[PDB]
Amino acid sequence: PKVLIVENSWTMRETLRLLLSGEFDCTTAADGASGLQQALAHPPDVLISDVNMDGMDGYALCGHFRSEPTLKHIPVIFVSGYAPADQPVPDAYLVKPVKPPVLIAQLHALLARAE
Numbered sequence: 041p042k043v044l045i046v047e048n049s050w051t052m053r054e055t056l057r058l059l060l061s062g063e064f065d066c067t068t069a070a071d072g073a074s075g076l077q078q079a080l081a082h083p084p085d086v087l088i089s090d091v092n093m094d095g096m097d098g099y100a101l102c103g104h105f106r107s108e109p110t111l112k113h114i115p116v117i118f119v120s121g122y123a124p125a126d127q128p129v130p131d132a133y134l135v136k137p138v139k140p141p142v143l144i145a146q147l148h149a150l151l152a153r154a155e
Contacts (some may be wrong), residue, residue: 044084046075072096088100091120115150
């Protein structure tokens with residue numbers, strides 16, 4: 041399964057990528073804008089994103105995903121330090137520090153549901 045990881049911290053971005061590389065094909069991006077570009081080009085099976093970012097925030101990124109016919113179906117997982125009907129919402133939300141095993145299980149559940 042292709043997992044797209046959007047996160048401002050390079051050390052954190054690198055951590056998830058390596059930890060998930062076992063059973064997932066991970067793509068990595070430093071911000072929403074970059075993440076969205078890569079997604080449109082090759083839609084991932086699931087998105088992992090931070091919420092409070094430097095530029096575009098998690099919900100706006102999710103918002104773009106929900107609006108793009110090509111990514112609308114992609115389940116989204118929010119990973120943040122912090123815990124309306126017309127606005128976008130993630131399919132799952134994990135609060136840092138994230139326990140690797142929990143994250144993995146979440147990915148599989150979401151990936152299975154979307155399918």
